[PDB]
Symmetry: C2
Subunit: 115 residues, 2 copies
Amino acid sequence: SFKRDGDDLVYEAEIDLLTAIAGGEFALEHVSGDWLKVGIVPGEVIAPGMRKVIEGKGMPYGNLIIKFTIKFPENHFTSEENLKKLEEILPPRIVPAIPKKATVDECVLADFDPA
Amino acid sequence: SFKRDGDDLVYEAEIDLLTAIAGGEFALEHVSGDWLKVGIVPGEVIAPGMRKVIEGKGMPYGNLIIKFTIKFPENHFTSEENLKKLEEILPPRIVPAIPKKATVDECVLADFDPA
């Protein structure tokens, strides 16, 4: 389903993380019935909630705005060796700078129950 | 700041993609003045908008709920060659299955200007 905002249409697309950061393709059926085949160029990253525009695919023409949702892999989707390799592909890590002499509580993350 | 949810507290934490999918650590000052040092175990993925619980760090005690936002790298953050390496670390890609005989419009993505 598409939402109408003035003369523009808004569509919420979901793509996998790989395509989001390494490029790929996705498609969707337009309200006209034609299918739009979209290519995400390697190098042009799609971030969570980011918006992009498809020129002239709106209403009498306006544009089509795609709002992206990125699906992440589940736990243990790869080996530890590969996870180490990610450190060489992705940008430098950000580590905490805890004030010296502050009291620190080493905590663990527990799963959140929807209800 | 922290939002009070009855007996629990809610904190909006932002981490880089690297830590989100490969593990690492982050810290935050608690309402008590104490600093919480959190370790994200390699293999335990954090997804956009995902919530996690730090038990006992709530209100007189309840729990602390952390809602994560994942910061993504800008465009051209690595070599084309490295992007292809991602293909072997992340799960299989999802590609378009467009109905044959359907009208197909090859589209390009343009930036979304807030103004």
